[PDB]
Design a protein around this ligand. Structure first.
Ligand code: NGA
Length: 283
């Protein structure tokens, strides 16, 4: 799959190459360690690419906004407040075939991240050894791919993404365990984004581009209007935003933040308010 590629603004588990069941874990306000995978937000990391530097910040997703930091001149690493220090940027360089990634410090590219036998991390000069190789797993792909899901608006604990009765228009409706409100989320390798298929009619969540900008269930198409970048909120891994591939500045949105059964769901410019936030759970 290409779902685990080192994309800007994607969120990952970062594992030692020798153990996919251990992940980089922010255990305290400053310390990181490899730990058994638990999928808490303190084990999730957002990549933020700096084009000028051709290097990334690696930000924990537990709400603290702290970033992976080499404690120069020492050999230790920590999470610290982002002060845009050169020691807070990392080159992420991938072996295309093995999928292993080297995490090399920007301030001193002689130094790479290394995991130790005792699960601690440090920086070190480069060897040929597996203790300096990491694998990246996209969190959302791991959790949601090929799963039957419900999508609740942040606006109301009992309002869900639902195909309307006797229409293709997609609306908010209270839960009644309907196949109209159940969506199979499937990653499409060609578009590098997701489709969401309504269980009731086997048609897909799709931006219908006219003055209304409603989403409807629509037949399978190659057009970008049917594909969605599902991401966590910038600093909250408990909520999602769905950006449409036809215009990635536009997102799945509840019309006028209304909560009434039948309220139109639309595609609208991103602003990040609660009517654009979705709680996705497995059925
Ligand atoms: C904060 C908020 O609700 N903004 C909504 C916007 O997201 C979109 O739904 C639009 C539809 O025309 O109406 C606005 O009031």
């Amino acid at each position: 799959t290409n779902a685990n590629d080192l994309r800007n603004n994607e969120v990952f588990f970062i594992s030692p190459s020798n153990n996919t069941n251990k992940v980089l874990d922010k255990i305290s306000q400053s310390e990181v360690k490899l730990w058994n995978k638990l999928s808490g937000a303190n084990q999730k990391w957002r990549l933020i690419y700096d084009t000028n530097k051709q290097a990334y910040k690696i930000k924990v997703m537990d709400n603290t906004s702290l970033i992976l930091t080499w404690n120069a001149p020492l050999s230790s690493v920590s999470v610290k407040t982002d002060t845009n220090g050169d020691n807070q940027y990392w080159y992420l360089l991938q072996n295309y075939i093995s999928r292993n990634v080297i995490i090399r410090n920007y301030m001193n590219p002689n130094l790479v991240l290394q995991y130790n036998i005792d699960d601690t991390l440090m920086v070190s000069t480069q060897t040929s050894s597996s203790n300096q190789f990491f694998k990246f797993s996209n969190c959302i792909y791991e959790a949601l791919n090929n799963r039957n899901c419900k999508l609740q608006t942040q606006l109301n604990s009992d309002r869900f993404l639902s195909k309307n009765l006797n229409s293709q228009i997609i609306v908010l409706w209270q839960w009644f365990d309907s196949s109209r409100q159940k969506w199979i989320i499937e990653y499409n390798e060609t578009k590098s984004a997701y489709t969401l298929k309504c269980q009731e009619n086997n048609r897909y969540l799709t931006w219908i581009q006219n003055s209304n900008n409603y989403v409807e269930t629509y037949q399978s198409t190659d057009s970008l209007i049917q594909y969605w970048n599902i991401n966590y909120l910038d600093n909250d891994a408990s909520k999602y935003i769905l950006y449409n591939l036809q215009d990635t500045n536009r997102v799945l949105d509840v019309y006028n933040s209304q909560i009434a059964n039948g309220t139109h769901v639309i595609v609208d410019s991103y602003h990040g308010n609660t009517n654009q936030q979705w709680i996705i759970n497995l059925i």
